[PDB]
Design a protein around this motif. Sequence first.
Motif, PDB file in Angstrom:
ATOM      1  N   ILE A   1      18.655  33.909  87.402  1.00 47.48           N
ATOM      2  CA  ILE A   1      18.292  32.710  88.118  1.00 47.48           C
ATOM      3  C   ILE A   1      17.875  31.658  87.102  1.00 47.48           C
TER       4      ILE A   1
ATOM      5  N   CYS B   1      25.716  26.292  86.960  1.00 48.16           N
ATOM      6  CA  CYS B   1      25.771  27.751  87.049  1.00 48.16           C
ATOM      7  C   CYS B   1      27.060  28.289  86.448  1.00 48.16           C
ATOM      8  N   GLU B   2      28.187  27.673  86.802  1.00 50.46           N
ATOM      9  CA  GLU B   2      29.470  28.061  86.223  1.00 50.46           C
ATOM     10  C   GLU B   2      29.480  27.841  84.716  1.00 50.46           C
TER      11      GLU B   2
ATOM     12  N   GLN C   1      27.721  30.696  83.096  1.00 46.92           N
ATOM     13  CA  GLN C   1      28.606  31.867  83.107  1.00 46.92           C
ATOM     14  C   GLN C   1      29.620  31.799  81.989  1.00 46.92           C
TER      15      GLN C   1
ATOM     16  N   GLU D   1      29.668  43.794  82.143  1.00 48.05           N
ATOM     17  CA  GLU D   1      30.364  44.293  83.315  1.00 48.05           C
ATOM     18  C   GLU D   1      30.431  43.200  84.379  1.00 48.05           C
ATOM     19  N   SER D   2      29.309  42.522  84.604  1.00 45.52           N
ATOM     20  CA  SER D   2      29.237  41.423  85.567  1.00 45.52           C
ATOM     21  C   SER D   2      28.067  40.494  85.276  1.00 45.52           C
ATOM     22  N   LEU D   3      28.258  39.204  85.548  1.00 46.34           N
ATOM     23  CA  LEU D   3      27.206  38.212  85.386  1.00 46.34           C
ATOM     24  C   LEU D   3      27.163  37.252  86.580  1.00 46.34           C
ATOM     25  N   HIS D   4      26.072  37.299  87.347  1.00 52.29           N
ATOM     26  CA  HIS D   4      25.849  36.365  88.448  1.00 52.29           C
ATOM     27  C   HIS D   4      24.740  35.398  88.066  1.00 52.29           C
ATOM     28  N   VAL D   5      25.038  34.108  88.122  1.00 50.24           N
ATOM     29  CA  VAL D   5      24.048  33.076  87.867  1.00 50.24           C
ATOM     30  C   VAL D   5      23.757  32.350  89.161  1.00 50.24           C
ATOM     31  N   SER D   6      22.483  32.262  89.514  1.00 49.18           N
ATOM     32  CA  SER D   6      22.046  31.494  90.669  1.00 49.18           C
ATOM     33  C   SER D   6      21.035  30.454  90.220  1.00 49.18           C
TER      34      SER D   6
ATOM     35  N   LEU E   1      18.622  46.711  92.651  1.00 42.98           N
ATOM     36  CA  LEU E   1      18.137  46.015  93.858  1.00 42.98           C
ATOM     37  C   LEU E   1      19.210  46.019  94.954  1.00 42.98           C
TER      38      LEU E   1
END
Lengths: 96, 104
Positions: free
Chosen positions: A41, A57-58, A61, A72-77, A96
């Motif tokens: 976040i 956010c992009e 990333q 493996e994975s990256l989520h940005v909020s 979570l």
Amino acid sequence: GSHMEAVQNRIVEAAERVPGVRGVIHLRARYVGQDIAADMIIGVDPENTVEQAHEICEAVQAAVCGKIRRIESLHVSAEAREIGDTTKPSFSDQPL
Amino acid sequence: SHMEAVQNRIVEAAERVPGVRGVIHLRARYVGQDIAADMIIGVDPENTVEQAHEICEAVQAAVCGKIRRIESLHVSAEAREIGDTTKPSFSDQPLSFDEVMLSK
């Protein structure tokens, strides 16, 4: 210290430099095999438009995934963050 | 299915809240006899981050007020264009990486 610590630092330092980011509020990063899954976040201007915040956010990333190996994975909020808020980044590593 | 019924009611409750352009995603699972839910809503791309946060809180209030035994409801927001008539997804999967959102 650890490789997980090193990866966290690089993720944070990369994100903090991206235009529009007012600090990293939270990074969750855990191992999935020998790769790393990460959820973060960032802080942004409360008066940015939803579209502007999506852009930022992009951009985070792209900066992280371009540089850093074995994600493996990256989520940005994004959430609103005020100027004056000097809270340092918070870390966690649990599911979570 | 009671889980199916609860999902439908969560969607219909959220879609009525001003500022919401449809429910894009709902994840709902049992925690005991309660239900934990994570939801992504669509909002106007020209809303401010702060406005989108307000709408998200309003969806939480509207869903938790109406529906019984929600252990937790996290609502997040993504820009969405008018004309996008895509129906809600109830997939349990992670979002794509060109799909980023505003949360809490």
